[PDB]
Every structure is written in C-alpha cells, then in structure tokens.
Design an enzyme around this catalytic site. Structure first.
Site, PDB file in Angstrom:
ATOM      1  N   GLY A 293       8.222   2.992   8.057  1.00  0.00           N
ATOM      2  CA  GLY A 293       8.340   1.674   7.466  1.00  0.00           C
ATOM      3  C   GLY A 293       7.357   1.436   6.326  1.00  0.00           C
ATOM      4  O   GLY A 293       6.735   2.389   5.833  1.00  0.00           O
ATOM      5  N   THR A 294       7.206   0.165   5.929  1.00  0.00           N
ATOM      6  CA  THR A 294       6.376  -0.264   4.781  1.00  0.00           C
ATOM      7  C   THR A 294       5.145  -1.127   5.167  1.00  0.00           C
ATOM      8  O   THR A 294       5.244  -2.022   6.015  1.00  0.00           O
ATOM      9  CB  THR A 294       7.228  -1.066   3.777  1.00  0.00           C
ATOM     10  N   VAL A 295       4.001  -0.880   4.524  1.00  0.00           N
ATOM     11  CA  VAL A 295       2.735  -1.515   4.918  1.00  0.00           C
ATOM     12  C   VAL A 295       2.108  -2.446   3.884  1.00  0.00           C
ATOM     13  O   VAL A 295       1.868  -2.050   2.749  1.00  0.00           O
ATOM     14  CB  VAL A 295       1.674  -0.462   5.276  1.00  0.00           C
TER      15      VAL A 295
ATOM     16  N   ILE B 250       0.827  -1.206   0.000  1.00  0.00           N
ATOM     17  CA  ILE B 250       0.000   0.000   0.000  1.00  0.00           C
ATOM     18  C   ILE B 250       0.867   1.264   0.000  1.00  0.00           C
ATOM     19  O   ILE B 250       0.674   2.173  -0.816  1.00  0.00           O
ATOM     20  CB  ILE B 250      -0.970   0.028   1.212  1.00  0.00           C
ATOM     21  N   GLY B 251       1.819   1.316   0.927  1.00  0.00           N
ATOM     22  CA  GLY B 251       2.713   2.454   1.061  1.00  0.00           C
ATOM     23  C   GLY B 251       4.054   2.030   1.611  1.00  0.00           C
ATOM     24  O   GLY B 251       4.344   0.837   1.682  1.00  0.00           O
TER      25      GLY B 251
ATOM     26  N   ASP C  72       2.360  12.538  14.997  1.00  0.00           N
ATOM     27  CA  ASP C  72       2.255  12.464  13.550  1.00  0.00           C
ATOM     28  C   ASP C  72       0.785  12.383  13.140  1.00  0.00           C
ATOM     29  O   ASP C  72       0.419  11.651  12.225  1.00  0.00           O
ATOM     30  CB  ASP C  72       3.063  11.278  13.007  1.00  0.00           C
TER      31      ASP C  72
END
Ligand SMILES: Nc1ncnc2c1ncn2[C@@H]1O[C@H](COP(=O)(O)OP(=O)(O)OP(O)(O)=S)[C@@H](O)[C@H]1O
Ligand SMILES: O=C(NOCCO)c1ccc2cncn2c1Nc1ccc(I)cc1F
Ligand SMILES: [Mg+2]
EC number: 2.7.11.1
Lengths: 229, 278, 306, 280, 229
Positions: free
Chosen positions: D17-19, D15-16, D124
C-alpha cells in the site's frame, strides 16, 4: 618559504591551540605578500576564535559582576577583569586591525576578498564598539558604520543574492543595527531584505551558499522573530 | 497475550511495590510484589494495573512489555537510561534552557492527553513518574494507582486515599465525594509539575509539617506561591500554571482546554538566543 | 517510405515547436497501462499542445546517476526510424524518471492480442519485418541491442506503423532497474539466463517466442496439453526460467501455419545462439520475402479489431 | 479496541500500500489502501496485518497505534524521525563504527526474536524495513506480509509469491512447498542484512538481470560473495553471516542462537582505546 | 585575602579559560597556607586541563608525523613543532612539581590529602614519562613508581575500598603498568583485584560520592575488557 608557515598554522589549528596559530598567521601577514582564498579563512578563523574568547570571559565577568552586587575584592576582581580581560580584548583587536591595514589593506586583487576584508574590519570594530562605552567607543562605532556601508555598496553592486559573503555582511550588519544601533524596526527590515536576496539567487545558492545560504536565512528568521517578539 | 512464561526474566539490581533492573530480551524494568502470599486485594491491584497498561501505546507512556505471575507478581516495562524529572530538577539541578522546559511540559501534556483520551486517570502524576529517557523524551510511568472511568457511579466503592501530598488536588485531599478523582485532578498534579519546571523548587518549602500541608491545602488556606517562578518564564506559562492549579476543579482546563493553553504556548514562546554571527 | 519521411518531418516540427520538459508542463488525459516498475500516461504537454505518452519508472537513485540517465536518454533525440517509437524528452521529478514519447494510439501488441485472440500469420509477417528493421536500426545506427523484446513492447498505430519501444539505450538506467520486483513470466533467452552469451542473438529468440505467443494467442508456459491444443494455477517464474533453460523450445502447431512461418520461428528459437539465425539470414527468409511482397491493410485490420 | 473513529486522523505528505505522514495525537505514520472499493482479498490483507501488529509491544517493533476503516482502510503507527537502514547504508553512506553496526545487528535480532517468540513470521525483512529511530534505536516495520504460523498444515492454501528478491531465501524463491516460509526464511533475510552491514553493498552488484538472480539463487548457482566484507568485520560476524545464509534452511540458527552469538562477538570487539588520565 | 583569590579562580574556571585560573591557583599556593578539601579540586582541575590541551596537541602532531611518510622539510618542521610542544609541556609540569614539593606535600596533615598529592605527583611524572624518550625516561619512570607505591601503601592501610581517591590511584597506577612499563599481566591482576574489592562494600555508598565511584568503576571495567582481549 610560505608553505611551511601555512602548514604550521593549519596543523596548529587542528590541535585546538589558538595562540601559536595567531602568531604564525601574523608572521605570515608581516611578510606583506597577498594571500590566496584558502590562506585567508585560516586568519579569520583564529581571529574570530580570539574575539569569541574575549566576548566569553569578558561576558562572564559582566553577568558575574551584576550577580555579586556587593562591595569587595571579589567585586574589585570583577571590575579588574573588565579593565584586564577588556585590556587583553583591546590588545588582540588592535593587533588584528594593525595586521589588516598593514597587510590585508595593502594587497587585495579579488573584489569579493575586499568585502571579506571590510566585513572583518566592521566585525572587529563593532565588537570593540559594543565592548567599550564613551567617545572612543562611539568613534569605533562610526568606523564600523563606514566599513559596513563600504562593504554594503560593493555587495549591492557586484555580488550574488545567494553568496555566503553578502549574506554574512547582511547578518553582521543587521545585528550591528540591533545591538549597537538598538533598533528592532530597521534591523528586522534589513534582515528580511537579506533573506529575500539570498532566496532570489536560487541557481546561485548552488555555488555561493545553497545549504549555508538556507542556514543564513534560518538565522535571519531567528533574529527577526526575536526582534518582533 | 502478554504473560511471560516463568524463567525468562532475570532480575538484577534494585532501585526503589518494588522495582528491579532485569533482563528479558534486553534491559527491562521489573516491578515486583515482594511478598509470597498475594492477598486478593493485591491481586486486583495487579490485574487493574496490567489492565490499564495494556491499553497504552504512545511514545510518552513508558512502554509496558508484559507481566509475570508464577515467581512473584510482576510488571515488565522498557528500561530507561537517564533520570526522572525529579532527579534533574531537585537533585542534579540540570540547567535546562527555557525552550527545553517548555518542551518537557509539552511532552508530559502529550502523554496525559493520550491517557485521558482513552479514559485513564493516572492518579499519581508527579516529577518522579516522569522520565527524561535518553534526556530527550518524556516517558510517564508508574501506573500503580491508574484507573479507568466507570460509566456507572456505584461501581466505585471504598479506596483508602494514597499518594504524594504535594501533587494532590484540594478536592482529592478532602475526599468528600465517592470519587474525587477526575481528569481535572491529574491536571492539578501537572500544575504542580509546571511549578517545579518554572521555579526549580517543590511547593511549600517553608512548611515541613506533613499533616499541616494536608490540612491547609484541603481547607483552601494554602496554595503554591506563584511569585517564585523564575524571571525567564513566559507569561503564558505562568498563567497556564495558575489555571491548572485552580482550586475549583471545573475552573482548571480539561481535555481540549488542557490541549489549548499548553498547545497554544507550544505554537508560541521561542528562541532565547539572537546570535547569527558566522 | 515517403509516408515515414513525412511522419519524421512532423515529429521534428513538434520537437522544435517545444523546448524543455518538467512535471508542471503536463496534464493527465488517461492511463495507457502499467507494468513491473513503470506506469504510462496519455498526457497533454501544455506548452506545445502535443499529446504524448509519459512513462514513469520509480527509482530511488543518486542525483549523479539520475542526471546520467537523463543525459544518456538524450541520444534518443537522434533515434529516427519508423520502426522505433519517437522520443520527446526525459526528466526526473519527485521519485521517478519520466520518459516522454510518441503516443501510439493502437497500443501494444499485448493489448491487441487480448482483443484479437490470435494474430493472423499475415499480420505477424509485417510485425516480423518491423521488428527486424528496428533491431537492425538500433544495432547499426546506435550500437545497442533491445534487451526486452515482447508483445507489450511492440507498439502499433492508426497509420499502420509498427514500432519498438522500451529498449536499452541508457546503460545507467539498465543498471538502476536491476533492483526490481519479481515478474510473473519471462521472454529472456536461455543463453542470457545462463550468462553464457550476450548479443543481438538473444533479442532474436525473444522475437521468436513473442511470435509464437501472438500466433497461438497464449503465453509460453511449457506449451499446452494435447487437449488444450484442440481448443485452439500459473507456473511460477522460477519454473518458467528453468523450463526455457532445460527444455526444448516451443513451436507452432502443425497445420494452421505455413511451413515458411513454422521454419521462421524455429530458426529464431534455436537454444544455441551460434546456430540461431541472425538478422541478415532472417531478412532474406522465405517468410520475409513472401510477407514483404504481400500487401496488407494492416492499418485497416488494426482499426477493425478495435 | 484500536479502531480510530473517522475524522480524527489528518493525512499530510507522502513518502512511498501507500504511506503518508499524518496527525493523530502527534506525528504518526499512516499507511493507506488508496483505492475505493476494497476487494475481499485486500480486506483480509488488512484484517491480517492489523491482527499481527496488535500482538506486538516491544521497543524494536515499530509501534502500531490503531487502524481506520471508514475513509479508507489504514494503519496508524508511530512516526519516525531519521532514516531507514537502507538509506544510511546505500544512500548517505553513513560511516558507522563497527561497534554500532554490531549493535544494529543486535537490536534487529532482538526485534526478530520477539516476533518469532510469538510465532509471527515477518516475510519481508530487509534494510528498508529497519528504521534507525532517532539514529539510536532499531524499529522493524512494514508488516504487510507478516503472518502467524498455523498449527494445521491445510489452512495455508495459495498465495502468489511477492517480496524483494535480494532478501528471499532459495527455498522461498523455489516455492516448492505448500508453505516455504519459516522462522528460518526470516533468518536468511537477516543474513542479507548482515551482508549490507558488514560490506556496505547489496548482494550481486555485478548482475542486473532480475530474472537471472531469481533463477540462479533458486537453483543454488548464486550466493553472496562473503569476501566483500570490510576488513574490520569481526571473524565471529562473518561466520554468523555465513551461517544465517546457509542454503539448507535447517542449517541456519534461530533468534535464540543469534542472541547467544550477538552478545559474545560485541564483548570480544571492545571499542575502548587510549585509556590514560581520566578526570572522573 | 584568600577568598578573593579562590573566587577569581572559580570564576575563571566558569569561563573555560585555563591560564588565568592556573596563575591564580599558583598565586594561592605561593602563600604557603594549607588548602581545604574544596580549594584542592580546583587546583587539580586547572593543572589537569593545561597539560591535557598540550597532550592532545602532542598526540595529533605525532600522528601527523607518523602519517606523512615522505622526505621533505615538513617532517623537520613538524618534528621541531613537537619538540617545542614538549618544551612547553615540560615547563608546565616542572612548574607543577615545584609548586607541589615545596608547599603541599611536606606540609600535609591529613593522610587522605597525602594520598591525593602523591597521586598527582605520580600522574605528572607519568605525563613527563610518556613524552621524553631516552636516558631521562628511566629517572621519571622510577620516580612515578616510588610515588605510586608510596600512595598505594597508604591506600591499602587507611582508605576505603569504595573511596574515590583509592579508586583513582588504582586506575592511574594500572594505566601506568599498561602504557609505561608494558606488563599487562600485573595490570590485569591489579585492576581485577581493585575491582573485586570494590564490589565488597557496594552497600556503603553515601550521597557524597556515588557518581565518582560508579564512574571510576565503569572506567575500570572498560579498561579490563580492553586488556583481556
Ligand atoms: N507510447 C505509448 N503509447 C501508448 N501506449 C503505451 C505507450 N507506451 C506504453 N504504452 C502502454 O503501457 C503498458 C506497459 O508497456 P511497457 O512500457 O512496454 O512495459 P511492459 O511491456 O508492460 O513490461 P513490464 O511488465 O513493466 S517489465 C502497456 O500497456 C503499453 O501499451
Ligand atoms: O522503459 C523501459 N522499461 O520498461 C519499464 C518497466 O515498466 C526501459 C528499460 C531499459 C532502458 C534502457 N534505456 C532506456 N530504457 C527503458 N526506457 C525506454 C527506452 C526507449 C524508449 I523510445 C522509451 C523508454 F521508456
Ligand atoms: Mg516494459
């Protein structure tokens, strides 16, 4: 003036009344002038809604009569509804086909529009073919068979494998094969062929169907899965 | 830590220990021990129930939010809008489509799978403790009888049998072992839930003698009449229901077997409508 | 001149040899580097066999503007100069605009400055010429300013070429890049930092600051202390920007550099853009006359330092 | 304990650390540290992020489900169907009714109130980290920068400033204190969220210079143009937005104040209309 | 036989057709026999739905009329269409009142039934009041006023503060005060009073009507929070 009539019909379509709309569109077609692309979908919309209402109340009478399984005036009324809402159903579709050959058959410049006119004719004939049982109903089924074959030829000739209209013709013709035809083999094969044709114009999905074409493919998957179940 | 400092919770209406609709950072559900002098038995009850909830975080377990001690002993959980499965099925007789019924089965199984995976036996699974939250999401609640499996057989000791009889497995009713509860007893209850889902009615509707049902079910004479499943019920479901309901507990599917007949059904039995007209 | 002509010829040849560009068309060779919002890969374009640099810039953007970015990048197809990195094509896949460009096997002067410690005033002379010609090229033949001149954006190669890259050609891409992560330093001119002014005069400042960094071999963070200059926790970016705006510009050390060089960087670093030398004035500068006329094995110096 | 034994998780799409979208007792979200040799700094990052999530159980905090170590470092959370608030507001430009917008504000505040109440500063918060789950429920996620307030002022030490600039408070940008984060910095971010909600656009749309925004906001020159609020925005919201956005952090009201004001404005802007002939 | 008629009307209500249903219920009431509790709610549902479809049509047509803001034949055609809707709307309500004041109100043994039929009479007079603008407004406004006052007296006398019918009368009479007469002070007072006496016997809520009672309750609260703004 035509534009007052089409604004009146469009305004009545926004008010969820489908009697003044159908009367206004019959009054449009009675002039005997050729429609646009825009003025046609309005005519089909109200006609499709009327066909749906006929299937809905008549369909309710069908299942409701089976649940009764007695011998009375309530049962007599269910039979009466089959004769009466069915006669009402018959009057609407005959008005449509008379307004079709009388006006839609007389003027038609776009060959795509001809497929829509023939797709509508097969739809109304098949609905009538589905409803009644006998020899006249068999004749209506034969009429729908000729109408859908005539539309299928022009679809295979001069249409896109990703256009909405060819997809709709494949969809209606497949459910014609399954419900009137009562065959799941040929119907599933036809649905698969239609889905393949829709996928095969990936560039032509963008203008002709794309998201709508994908939805039609999903409907074919739903029909195919059900017929293979 | 999940202790809610006193004063923050704002108890309101009542529903059915005892349960109130309250307020604490939005609508919540507050379950209280009405009384004033908590016996050390009611105390361990509370400690245990909190202990179990603390280990749950899953969309099909009703969301534990925290507990209070000082005013009264209480457990705070998410509020639910919408009714219990009991209410849909036997009160307002909601006309769910078969795909929905299967899905409710599926989700209920999902929540149970998650509990058993962390060794929690619910012990009071039934229609009433299954909420269709926003009509779309099954949340299993009421962990008042929930317990965690002890590695050691002598920790058990004596507990007076309690619970709703229509969902109690024959071995639980008989109450012959030190511990007659098992993952399998939960499955049986879920079996009765399948029954309500596929039939629309509770079991034993011709019998209104409470003690007779306890006696006849425990003895093997009485068991749900599977013929009462509605005709649109997939054959796989009827089989799966009969399997969850087996009298010999080991016979009923467990853990992976539980997530096989239901999981297998989930990847199958679909589309009650063939419409495609556009 | 003839060499640059031949290079452009070969570039156009490979361009015509290839056709369209898309993600499947590529095979990864190695990672040339990464920045604040972008990544660069040495790749092999499978259809043509060409080795090229592939830059990916992550952007979440509407189809209508991604397509506008691509379309605006297509102007680079005409940007042909030996002071400007070459352009093969551009596209959007997954979540990322790709710019495919002339692979420069020498790297960025940023990479070089790490291995070389300090760059000799004589090499910097060639660099200063390269930058000016390139800024001139961009300005006159393509109506655009660079926006982002700094050591990491001047690229050098085996044939001794010094080219500019990462300049602001697509106006839409500029816009889409504004939603960005925070940098750790800055080469932005003070007048831009204050929204007071915006012209090529600002790219001149950045060249100025770059040069000082490349000469001394250390980035500009309020210069260096008396002790630190003898040898030869980081200041937060807001403090850097506040410096640039409110303090006197950096400058070259007294003895180690020719007076012509010291004068050159100085006219590039004047706070007020008006009083700041322009490209015409810089071109005929003592430092440029000298360096132009000098002959340096730049290509040789480069390979020898790697 | 919340360690998920290796092998159980089944990583899928990205989808997009990394997810990644994965599988572990149903659809889950898996956030991984792609690399192979976790530095002790990436390690403490992980330890800290897990530490914070562990303390959250609330319907508006995205549901932490467990973590994995062995394959790669990873955090498992509930999967969400439906988009981020960012996506609704600036991508598909969802035409929410004002009562809905107020409600999104309300829920976001509810989740933040809950975090601050347990002393967690998110650090955030922004549109992207606010998910409209099933289009009906705000779940605040991404706790990669989240931290718990230490009672002692010398535990802080040095952390390189990171985060999205459009939501960073001036004091955070300036980064003059040992610890410039506070509950109030979170409020400011929420202030920018109100801005997106009541205007439909991000702040500073005329400025595309990243460093300029950092510099002008930190300096006091630049601040959101409140005139861009849409006309159906209740006056109480505009005021509440301007208050969350105050430059002097102590002038910004907390989550309890938001709860105090979030109820009354919604009650004042009734969505009831027409009211005639009810079948009941 | 009556039971065939009520099964026919109930079956047509299940089919979402509200023309055959209204005709069947008019044929029921034309016999002149007294209804049950069950056979009455069907009649109110039918003659509520028929007027409601035309009400939605009237509202959207009038909003287009206020939307156009030009000078052409569209406004004349749209205004004429609105007049036609009023003529159809007028015919339905006159058929209702003629079927009401000749077989049901003068033969009404149950006082609860009298509150019901008077509530319906006040409703349909309000329905006519919102649409006819001129001198004839002041007749039907006062007619609905007398009807709702007559219902309000029997509600205050021999009804429960938690019954559905008294709550519905309070609701319709409050929206009558707000929309027709535009005195929101007395409507605010009235709805607040009805809501506070609705709180008193909250314990006395049997299974026959919990859903209706709480539904009118939250509707009352929504109208109150709209009007106190
Ligand atoms: N065509 C290329 N050939 C070889 N290396 C390249 C090429 N383009 C970029 N690189 C390298 O990729 C790295 C990033 O360079 P740029 O694309 O100019 O971005 P940047 O200078 O790092 O600015 P930021 O920090 O992302 S705002 C550098 O190490 C380059 O040397
Ligand atoms: O690349 C850029 N910024 O660096 C990314 C941060 O890492 C960049 C930035 C702005 C821009 C406007 N129009 C193109 N623009 C860029 N691209 C680019 C331009 C010319 C060439 I030749 C090659 C390129 F890739
Ligand atoms: Mg760059």
């Amino acid at each position: 003036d035509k534009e007052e009539l089409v604004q009146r019909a469009k305004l009545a379509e926004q008010a969820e009344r489908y009697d003044d709309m159908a009367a206004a569109m019959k009054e449009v077609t009675e002039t005997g002038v050729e429609l646009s692309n825009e003025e046609r979908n309005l005519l089909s919309v109200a006609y499709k809604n009327v066909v749906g209402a006929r299937r809905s109340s008549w369909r309710v009478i069908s299942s409701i009569e089976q649940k009764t399984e007695g011998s009375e005036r309530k049962q007599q009324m269910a039979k009466e509804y089959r004769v009466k809402v069915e006669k009402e159903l018959r009057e609407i579709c005959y008005d449509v086909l008379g307004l079709l050959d009388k006006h839609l058959i007389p003027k038609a410049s776009n060959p795509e529009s001809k497929v829509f006119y023939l797709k509508m004719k097969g739809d109304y004939y098949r609905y009538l073919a589905e409803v009644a049982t006998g020899e006249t109903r068999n004749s209506v089924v034969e009429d729908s068979q000729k109408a859908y074959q005539d539309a299928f030829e022009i679809s295979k000739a001069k249409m896109q494998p990703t256009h909405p209209i060819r997809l709709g013709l494949a969809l209606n013709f497949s459910v014609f094969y399954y419900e009137i035809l009562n065959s799941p083999d040929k119907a599933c094969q036809l649905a698969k062929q239609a889905f393949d044709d829709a996928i095969a114009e990936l560039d032509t999905l963008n203008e002709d169907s794309y998201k709508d074409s994908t939805l039609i493919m999903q409907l074919l998957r739903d029909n195919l899965t059900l017929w293979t179940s | 830590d999940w202790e809610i400092p006193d004063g923050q919770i704002t108890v309101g209406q009542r529903i059915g220990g005892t349960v109130y609709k309250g307020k604490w950072h939005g609508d919540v559900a507050v379950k209280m021990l009405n009384v004033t002098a908590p016996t050390p038995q009611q105390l361990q009850a509370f400690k245990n129930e909190v202990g179990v909830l603390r280990k749950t975080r899953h969309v099909n377990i009703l969301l534990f939010m925290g507990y209070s001690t000082k005013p009264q002993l209480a457990i705070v959980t998410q509020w639910c809008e919408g009714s219990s499965l009991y209410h849909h099925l036997h009160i307002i007789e909601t006309k769910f489509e078969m795909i929905k019924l299967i899905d409710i089965a599926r989700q209920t199984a999902q929540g149970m799978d998650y509990l058993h995976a962390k060794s929690i036996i619910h012990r009071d699974l039934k229609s009433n403790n299954i909420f269709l939250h926003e009509d779309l999401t099954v949340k299993i609640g009421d962990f008042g009888l929930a317990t965690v499996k002890s590695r050691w057989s002598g920790s058990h000791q004596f507990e007076q049998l309690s619970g709703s009889i229509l969902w109690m497995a024959p071995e639980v009713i008989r109450m012959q072992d030190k511990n007659p509860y098992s993952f399998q007893s939960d499955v049986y209850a879920f079996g009765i839930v399948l029954y309500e889902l596929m039939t629309g009615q509770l079991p034993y509707s011709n019998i209104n003698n409470r003690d007779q049902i306890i006696f006849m079910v425990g003895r093997g004479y009485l068991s749900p009449d599977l013929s009462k499943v509605r005709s649109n019920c997939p054959k796989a479901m009827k089989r799966l229901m009969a399997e969850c309901l087996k009298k010999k507990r080991d016979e009923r599917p467990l853990f992976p077997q539980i997530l096989a007949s239901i999981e297998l059904l989930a990847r199958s039995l679909p589309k009650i409508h063939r419409s495609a007209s556009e | 001149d003839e060499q640059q002509r031949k290079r452009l010829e070969a570039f156009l040849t490979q361009k015509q040899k290839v056709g369209e560009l898309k993600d499947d068309d590529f095979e990864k060779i190695s990672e040339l580097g990464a920045g604040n919002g972008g990544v660069v890969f040495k790749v092999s374009h499978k259809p043509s066999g060409l080795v090229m640099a592939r830059k990916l810039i992550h952007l979440e953007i509407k189809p209508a503007i991604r397509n506008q970015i691509i379309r605006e990048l297509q102007v680079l197809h005409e940007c042909n100069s030996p002071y400007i990195v070459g352009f093969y094509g551009a596209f959007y896949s997954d979540g990322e605009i790709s710019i495919c460009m002339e692979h420069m096997d020498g790297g960025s002067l940023d990479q070089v400055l790490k291995k070389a410690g300090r760059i000799p005033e004589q090499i910097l002379g060639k660099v200063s010429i390269a930058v000016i010609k390139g800024l001139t090229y961009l300005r006159e033949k393509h109506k655009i300013m660079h926006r982002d001149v700094k050591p990491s954006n001047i690229l050098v190669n085996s044939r001794g070429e010094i080219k500019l890259c990462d300049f602001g050609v697509s106006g839409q891409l500029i816009d889409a890049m504004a939603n960005a992560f925070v940098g750790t330093r800055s080469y932005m001119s003070p007048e831009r930092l204050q929204g007071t002014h915006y012209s090529v005069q600002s790219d001149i400042w950045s060249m100025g600051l770059s040069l000082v960094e490349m000469a001394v071999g250390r980035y500009p963070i309020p210069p260096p202390d008396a002790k630190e200059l003898e040898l030869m926790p980081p200041m937060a970016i807001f403090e850097l920007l506040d410096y640039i705006v409110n303090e006197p510009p950096p400058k070259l050390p007294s003895g180690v550099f020719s007076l012509e060089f010291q004068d050159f960087v100085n006219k590039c670093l004047i706070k007020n853009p008006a009083e700041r030398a322009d490209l015409k004035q810089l071109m005929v500068h003592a430092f440029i006359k000298r360096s132009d006329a000098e002959e340096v094995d730049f290509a040789g110096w480069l390979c020898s330092t790697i």
